[PDB]
Every structure is written in structure tokens, then in C-alpha cells.
Swiss-Prot record, chain A:
It comes from the Bacteria. The chain holds residues 3 to 217 of 273 of the full protein. Binds the lower part of the 30S subunit head. Binds mRNA in the 70S ribosome, positioning it for translation. Belongs to the universal ribosomal protein uS3 family. Part of the 30S ribosomal subunit. Forms a tight complex with proteins S10 and S14. Residues 38-108 form the KH type-2 domain. It comes from Mycoplasma pneumoniae (strain ATCC 29342 / M129 / Subtype 1) (Mycoplasmoides pneumoniae). The lineage of its organism: Bacteria, Bacillati, Mycoplasmatota, Mycoplasmoidales, Mycoplasmoidaceae. GO terms for molecular function: mRNA binding; rRNA binding; structural constituent of ribosome. This is Small ribosomal subunit protein uS3. One of its GO terms (cellular component) is cytosolic small ribosomal subunit.
Swiss-Prot record, chain B:
Belongs to the universal ribosomal protein uS10 family. SMART domains: Ribosomal_S10. Involved in the binding of tRNA to the ribosomes. One of its GO terms (cellular component) is ribonucleoprotein complex. Part of the 30S ribosomal subunit. Pfam families: Ribosomal_S10 (PF00338). GO terms for biological process: translation. The gene is rpsJ. Keywords: Ribonucleoprotein, Ribosomal protein. InterPro entries: Ribosomal_uS10 (IPR001848), Ribosomal_uS10_CS (IPR018268), Ribosomal_uS10_dom (IPR027486), Ribosomal_uS10_dom_sf (IPR036838). This is Small ribosomal subunit protein uS10.
Swiss-Prot record, chain E:
Keywords: Ribonucleoprotein, Ribosomal protein. Disulfide bonds: none annotated. Gene3D superfamilies: 3.30.230.10. SUPFAM superfamilies: Ribosomal protein S5 domain 2-like (SSF54211). GO terms for cellular component: cytosolic small ribosomal subunit. It comes from the Bacteria. HAMAP family: Ribosomal_uS9_B. Pfam families: Ribosomal_S9 (PF00380). This is Small ribosomal subunit protein uS9. Belongs to the universal ribosomal protein uS9 family. It comes from Mycoplasma pneumoniae (strain ATCC 29342 / M129 / Subtype 1) (Mycoplasmoides pneumoniae). One of its GO terms (molecular function) is RNA binding. InterPro entries: Ribosomal_Su5_D2-typ_SF, Ribosomal_uS9, Ribosomal_uS9_bac/plastid, Ribosomal_uS9_CS, Ribsml_uS5_D2-typ_fold_subgr. The keyword Ribosomal protein applies.
Swiss-Prot record, chain F:
The keyword Ribonucleoprotein applies. Keywords: Ribonucleoprotein, Ribosomal protein, RNA-binding, rRNA-binding, tRNA-binding. This is Small ribosomal subunit protein uS13. HAMAP family: Ribosomal_uS13. The gene is rpsM. InterPro entries: Rbsml_uS13_C, Ribosomal_uS13, Ribosomal_uS13-like_H2TH, Ribosomal_uS13_bac-type, Ribosomal_uS13_CS. It comes from Mycoplasma pneumoniae (strain ATCC 29342 / M129 / Subtype 1). One of its GO terms (cellular component) is cytosol. Located at the top of the head of the 30S subunit, it contacts several helices of the 16S rRNA. In the 70S ribosome it contacts the 23S rRNA (bridge B1a) and protein L5 of the 50S subunit (bridge B1b), connecting the 2 subunits; these bridges are implicated in subunit movement. Contacts the tRNAs in the A and P-sites. Residues 90-113 have a biased composition (Basic residues). Part of the 30S ribosomal subunit. Forms a loose heterodimer with protein S19. Forms two bridges to the 50S subunit in the 70S ribosome. The keyword Transmembrane helix does not apply. Gene3D superfamilies: 1.10.8.50, 30s ribosomal protein s13, domain 2. GO terms for molecular function: rRNA binding; structural constituent of ribosome; tRNA binding. The lineage of its organism: Bacteria, Bacillati, Mycoplasmatota, Mycoplasmoidales, Mycoplasmoidaceae.
Amino acid sequence: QKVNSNGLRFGINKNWISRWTANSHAQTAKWLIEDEKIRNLFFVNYRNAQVSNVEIERTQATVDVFVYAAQPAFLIGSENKNIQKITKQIKQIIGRTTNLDLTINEIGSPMLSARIIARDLANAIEARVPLRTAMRQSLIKVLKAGANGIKVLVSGRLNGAEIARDKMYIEGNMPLSTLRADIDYALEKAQTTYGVIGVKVWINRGMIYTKGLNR
Amino acid sequence: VKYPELKIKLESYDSTLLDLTTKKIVEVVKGVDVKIKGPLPLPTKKEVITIIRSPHVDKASREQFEKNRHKRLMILVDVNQGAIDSLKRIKIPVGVTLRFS
Amino acid sequence: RKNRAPKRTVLPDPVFNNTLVTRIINVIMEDGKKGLAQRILYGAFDLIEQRTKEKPLTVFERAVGNVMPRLELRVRRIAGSNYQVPTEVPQDRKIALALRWIAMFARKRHEKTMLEKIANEIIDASNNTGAAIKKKDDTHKMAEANKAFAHMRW
Amino acid sequence: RSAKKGAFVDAHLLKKVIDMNKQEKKRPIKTWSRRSTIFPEFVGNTFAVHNGKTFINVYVTDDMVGHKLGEFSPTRNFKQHTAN
Amino acid sequence: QSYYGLGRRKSSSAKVYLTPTQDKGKITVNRRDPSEYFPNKLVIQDMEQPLDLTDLKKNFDINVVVKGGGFTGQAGAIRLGIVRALLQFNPELKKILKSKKLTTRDKRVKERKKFGLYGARRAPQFTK
Amino acid sequence: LGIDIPNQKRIEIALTYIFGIGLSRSQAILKQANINPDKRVKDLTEEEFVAIRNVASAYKIEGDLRREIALNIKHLSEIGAWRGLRHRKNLPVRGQRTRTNARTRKGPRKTVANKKIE
Amino acid sequence: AKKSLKVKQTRIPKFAVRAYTRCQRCGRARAVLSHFGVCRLCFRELAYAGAIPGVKKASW
RNA sequence: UUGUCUAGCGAGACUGCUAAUGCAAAUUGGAGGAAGGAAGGGAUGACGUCAAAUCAUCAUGCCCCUUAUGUCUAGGGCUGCAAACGUGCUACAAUGGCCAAUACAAACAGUCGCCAGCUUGUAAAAGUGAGCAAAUCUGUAAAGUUGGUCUCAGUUCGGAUUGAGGGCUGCAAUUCGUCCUCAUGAAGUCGGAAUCACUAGUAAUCGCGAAUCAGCUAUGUCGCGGUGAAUACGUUCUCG
RNA sequence: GGUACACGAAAAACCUUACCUAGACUUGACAUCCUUGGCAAAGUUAUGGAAACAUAAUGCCGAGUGACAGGU
């Protein structure tokens, strides 16, 4: 079908999820096989964290895991129990050879990000929720909270029928023909008792032409 | 002094991110020391990763992701104490890796 | 339905000063090289003044002027017994067809080293002995043979 | 050939063939592989080699120094061509 | 006056120094003979074409250093360099050298070879 | 020993046809035996022809070459073995496919219709 | 046999002829990248998510 | 006989101003200019079409074994062969072939490697001896070209294939990595009904590196390139 | 046929691999929990074997028991 914006207009306009580099076939294998697990865990284990994006920051066996979240208290928490829990989890998933020093930072109106919307929609789908009402509420919450037009499509089973007829939403200006529009994208896989349902959301962060690279 | 003529190459995965570090080195090295070689671009020995789209038959259309291993050579010809003090504490962005002698 | 497109003609061969020369060099193209067909054409001219003596420039321009065709035939069919209808073409395709004819009748032959065979081929095509002039005569004579079907043009 | 450790045997197929060649010619041994480099010290005996199937006993010969055991074990069969 | 140009035809890179001095205009491409650098074919005069339009081998001494291209590739490199130095002499002759298609780079270079395109543009086929 | 063939090309090239002496060992002879190239020359000297047929035998005798080849073919085909088995059927033995290939030993093509299904 | 693939990657008793590299998440050493230790489409979706250094659609 | 260079940006190219047409928009010409008007390539692939491909990323709904379809080492096939599509290479040759040398990169890879230069060699290579985590040090860049020959031959095309013996890596190289000293000169001397890709670096074509790989009968392909045209009237056949 | 083929495959000595025959393996080869510690066993060189598989042998590190892990 259509291309995904988070790979189309990426690398020139949007900041990387993982900022690291190295020479060829020396040590990039471990880093690339390691960053994905942490990225997936930050959305699966900490569902309530509401991470707009995790900034993986690796340079010669040291990682500075940054998080952009609406409230630090999701991962910082009261009495610093959330911070120690997340630090120990990421340390056990990263080993003792790499420091963590993770930080959580506020991001301006995180609803203009796609990862949280995709993850929450997947959790709703795999929780056996009415798809119509859940999609309506997600669209309302993502349009009302200060974000521009949205482009949501849920493919797979529609909880009873319409398997090959994916429910695709189109709101506001969503030009994939544009190459600088800050159309953030994220795909997620809901593991429900009907298999896996794929949710993809394009969210407009405001046109990114001549806007730089920082997310 | 303090390891003179320290050949510090810089390589990154982003285009502007590495030239930014090179310019930061060339500007921070001045004001405390003069006549230092600045931006010295290299062939930037990158690699191209060709990946197919479908999990099944496709080879006439397999797009490439470009882990562009850029490369800028930074050579200090005047290695006064302030120049290399700034050099060792350039504090490049984390996406930048320095090969220093 | 695409229409008239901006076809481009590259700079002439700057060792003989003729665009037809470079077109011939780039139509008999083997292995992709022009340093190849340039040597081919130079040796062909050398053997031309060796056997069947004639000035390369005059003979080349005469061949270019003469071997060009007159019209083209478009295939037309309705129910059965398909036929041809005359049509006019710009001279660019005429000299292109001359290029293709020379390449096809030169690159393939026995009768050893290619130098003398291509020299003989171009000389025969030049002096109106049938190697490409026969096609020009036929396409004129073809229109008056199937004129009963040529008239049926829409 | 291999030309770099190209005359190596796993030292466990080698033991049985060394013993059996020197008894008189004893054929059956439970040394099944394709890695036994042929040397003139293995003459007269057969190996229960692995053709991708059960241990088939094939008569090994020793003429080359780089050719190997599986040279004597069949691994592919004829076409047995059919008209349709 | 010495003119400095840019020769990058066929993904090349060249320095030229056009000096209209008493020198005839010897083409010193990488400091070796053109007989081995180039064939004696159209290329041996394709290299001199910029001189051919500037009083061939009687003016504009061509001190040219190059890297990039083959035999006609290097000739094209020096050609673009010489014509661009001529343009640098006076920023008004770009129009008249545009017609010859030597300067005003027509981008004639083996473009980015695509995935699935074997001749760098040829698709396998419309497979039956 | 060997078959004497006249030359229209150089001597090495005339040797390329005969069995046991090919394009490369005759090249070695030509670079080592100081053989005059044949510029439209039928032959420099006849007496050397058969002599050349022996000099390449310094590397490996052509008769010995063919004798060893045939002896290995028969030995490794008669006994239980693989290389001789694939050689006797006239198919490639050094790992060349036969699905749409290996027909360099099967002849150009022997078209026979195969099984068709609905 | 995804477990078999990874275990055959890891365990080597005394024969290092069984050497190769593969993805530690989904195996499939066919079309793997020893540069990145990962298969093809998983790499592609990871880069689409933006978690891979250098992400663009055939920019050359 | 260095500010090309490599990589970033700015000016710029954006109908900018003029004339013209077009009720509009929009288009053509002319200046500066890299291009005069989406500037050549790539990406950008909309509802849905084939209920196309995939349970083979993975997740798995369902259907399937569990002290056993899990795991496993070892070995073998995945290069079988009468056969038929398709990709290229490579040739059907003298534009070339073999022999020796030569110029060039865009670049990319390389510290069981790349190896300069050098010794042996008809070599996969046997090694001496700098340098390089990589514009240095290297990977023949070659085709092109230079000099001899070949006189259009089943050919000095084409290296396909196979055996006597070795070489790179890897416990093991026969099968299934491989190539070479030596052998071979297959088929194919221009390709049927029927067609596709391909419009300025396009096809065609020749190279350097590499993806998996311990290593590779990838000649390929993937990236970068080197040589390098023509046509495109027009929808008449034609197809979406 | 489009919607597959120098394809998914960007490598076929075994691995890569999915089958093949040859060997053990029974919470099992790996793995969550139960269970037991400071000396604990993946892999080691001989060694039947081709190697698991028992070994003599070593790493703040691990074995068995039923629930379970695994599935190109």
C-alpha cells in the first residue's frame, strides 16, 4: 500500500531514536540487537510511561537512555521507586558493562507523537475493547489536545468481520508527497485472542520544512 | 605539548552532525591558539544497506538505508596547551565518535 | 498517449567535424566504446583510399545524402488482410535508419579483417550499388504497388 | 584439495582404520563421516560411510593425498528419465 | 591573466590554470603524454576541443591536473575545467558556452545505480 | 608422439586443438623455446614441430595426461564411488547444476514433453 | 526450529566449522547482516521506526 | 607546477523582471544564471483492485508434537536431470582474442586482512619486507591505448566442463566452496510462433569494493563509477 | 502470467537449513518456578564416538524434581 512517513521524511528532518555509529561489522551488531529490545521494553513493560520517544545515545560502550514523556512521575515516581525500578530493569537488560544514567524530560504537547497513540491503540485492541468507540476516543483525544490532522489505519480483524477491508482514517493535511512535514509515524502489533492487529498512526507535528533536526 | 599532533578523526551517522563537530573544534581551538588546521573532509567511507520490502518475493524493489559513515579529519598543527585542552574536551554529540591517537 | 518529445543530438565527432560521423560511430557501437568505432572508421577510410579509392569526406556526405529513405509504412487492419499506409518522417529518423543499416550490414560478415569489409560496405552503400539505396527505391516503388490499400488512410 | 590442514583426520575415524588395516583387512567399523583423507596406510579395508542414509559399507582406495572419504560413498543418483 | 576553473565532468575533479602566455597550450594532463593517457582517436582532439574553440594550440596554455574519468572521462574533465576557467575570466560568456554543452554541466554521469536495475537502469523483465 | 599440425597462426595456437597440449602450456613453450611468430608464415621449421610435442611433456606428458584421466575414470567408476559415478553418466563432477544447466555434457537439447497438471 | 537456529549459532563443542552470525531476536541467518547481526525486514521496520543510524528511502 | 579536493550551507533555479497568451490559473520566449520554467536519476505508491506474497521477520487466532514435529551433532542434498521460463554474464570475434605494460577515479573494504615494492612461478599463489581501523598503506581499475600475432575458423571468440597435482580460509574441501600448473576447446558462427527492459549518461558495455560468508562455480547482484548514441511521427498495431 | 524467481535467499562441505539417516536428551539441548551454596559448571585436552552423551580437569558460579519451555 502506502509508504511509512517515519522512514520517508526521516534522517533529514527528524531526530533519530538511536544516536550511535561505528565502523563496519566490528561492533554495530550488538548495539543494533540491543537498542531494539530496550525500545520495545520502554513501551511494553512501562505502558503508563507514555514515552513520546526514547533517545538511545551510545558511543563506545556507554548509553544515555533519554525519555521524552508527558510526566516524569511515570518513570521517576514518588519516593524514587519508579526510577530505581526502571534503572534496574534497563541495567539487567543492558548488562554491567554500560552505564545508564537515564533521564526523563517533558516534551511539548506529546499528543503530537505517534508512538504513544499506536501503543495505546494496540493495547486497546488486544484488550478486546469495542473498536469503533476506542478509535473514536483516540481520534478525539489526539485532535483536541493541540495536534494537527491525523491519519490512522487499523488493519487485520475488525473484531468479527472486515478482515481485508482495513479501517483507514484521514484527518487534516497529511501529505506524504511532502518531504518536510513532520508526519511522525509508528506501527504497533496488538496481540489479541484473534491474532495480531496492526495499528499505524501518522500524526502532524507541524510542518518541519526549514525547522532543523531536533524532535 | 600534552601529546602533540594528536590525529583526531571524527566519524558519524549523520550529515550535518559531523560537520557541526568539526566547526565546533575549529572555532573553540581559536581565541587561545592560532594557526590550527580546520575542516579537512575525507571520502567519508560509508556503507549502503539494501533491504527488501515484503517478507517474500521482492528484489527489483528493495530500498536502501544509508548508515552514512561520514569522516572528517581534525589535525592540530599548533598544539599549545589551550588548543588541545579544548580538543580533549570538545564534547561532541553522542552520535559522533572520535578516533584519537 | 505520449507526443513529440525533445530528442537531443550530441556534439559532432571533433576529429572529423561531422555530426553524422559521430552518429555512425555510436550506432556501430561494440562494447560501448567510441575509441573503438573511431578506429574502425579511420581504418575503413584508410583502406578506402587503399582499395576503391575515394575521399572519405565527400563519399561520407554523398552516402548520407543518398541512402536516406523517402516515406514509412504504418500497418492498418480492420477485419482481415492487413496492409500499409504511407506516412512522412523527419530526416532525423531517416539518418538514424541509415545508421542502423550501416551497423547491421557492417558488424556481421565473413571475408576477413573487418576493416576492409566495412570499407567495402560503406563504399557500396555510397556508389548507389544496392546495399541501402535499394530500400530507398523500393519504398518509393512500394507506394505505387499497394496504392489500392495506401489510399485507405484516415 | 585444501592445502592447509588438508591431510587431517579427526583422529577418531583414523584409529579404527589404523587398527583394521593392520589386523588383516577388517571391513566393518563404526566410523561414519566424509572427512577421512585417504593415505596409503588405509589399504584393503572398507568404511561404513554416510551417504545421507544408513551406514553403507564402501571399499576405500588410497591414490591421492587430498581426496577424501566421501569420494567412495554415493551421494547422487541417475536421472531415471521419464517420458512424461 | 591566469584563470581557475572547475572540471567535474563524468564524476571527475580537476584544477585548470589557463595562462594565455607565449606557450602554445600543451595539455599536461597528470604530467604524462596524451598518447598513452588518451587514444589517438576522437579523444585526442576531444581533449583539445576547448582550445579548438579558443584558438587551438596557439593560446590558453592548459596546466591541468585531474582525477576522475577514463580516457574520454579525463578529456571531459579537462574540457569542463578549461571552459569553466574561461567563464571565470568574465562572468558573461556562460551563455555562449552553454550551447556547446561543455560547461553548464549537463549532468552526463553514470547516475546512482538502482536496486533491481542490472544495467543500472534495466529492469529484469515483465515476467510471464 | 603427438600429431604434427601446420600453422597459419602461431605454433601455440595450432597446438591448442590437439589433445594434451593446450593454450597455456604451448604459451609457456612459446615464451621459453624462442619461437618465431607467424606473420602470414606457414612455418619456420618443420623439424621442431614434433619436438615441441615433447617439450611440454616436461610439465606433464600428454599421453600420461590422458592415460591418468582414463585410468582414474575407470577406477572410480567401476568401484563404489561418486566422482566416477557422475563422470560415467557424462555429467559435471565439480559441483555444477543440472536443473537447467550441466547440458554442456548432455548435448545442446533433447526436447521431450514433461508431465502437465491441471 | 528458531531455537535450533540460535543454539546452533551459540554452542560449538570442538568444531568451529559451524561458524556464522545471525539475529539474536529472530534468527534467519539467510539475508542476515553480520554488520548489524539482524535479518532483513526486522531491520527495515526498525529503521522505519527510526532506531537505526541512517534512515531514508533510497536517497543515494 | 594544492584551495579542484571531501562535505555542509548560503546565494541560486524560484516565471525573478519584460513581451505575449489565457475571463482565471497557468504556459512560451529573452536577462543574471547550473538549468527557464516537475532543472537529468531516486524516494514520495491515495480509496481499493489481484479476498496478490508471506503463519518464512515476528506475533500468533485456529489447526498441530511434546521424555518430543522441541533440541542435537555428524553427514548429505538445497549445483540431481530427458525436459520448459527468467535473470545476467559471456561469446558467437577482429570494435576483438592471447601475450606484457599503461592512465583514471567515484569511491568502498581491509590489522586469521588489505598488501605497496621485491624474490619463485605457466599458479590457485609460495613468501620477504613498509604501511593502514583505513584520502596515507593497499586492493591490477580495467575496458580504452601502446607493440606482435591472429585473416573470420566452431575460431588465440567463449573459458563451459572434467581428470593427474596443489593453493586461500575453515576439525574435515569427495560429494557442494573454490581456483589454478597441465589437459578441454562444450554449446552457441546471431537465435521460431511471442515479447519485455531501455529516451543524456539511457540502453549497450567494462571495471573497483562489498551483502551473506570461517571460505566460496556470484561470471552475478548489490553500491559507486569508466566508455557510451539514436530515435520517441503518433495512438495506425498496441496496452494500462 | 500482473500478483514468483540472480525470488523470500544478501552464498549449498556439516551451520546457514526447513528435510535425510547416525547418536544420545528427558522439565529435558536451551529455558520460568520449586529445590541446594561459596566453590560452581557451559567449553577444554586424551578419550568409544563424528559430537552430544559419563568422565580426570577448570569461570564469585551453578545441577536435579514436577509444574513448563520450543517450534524456517
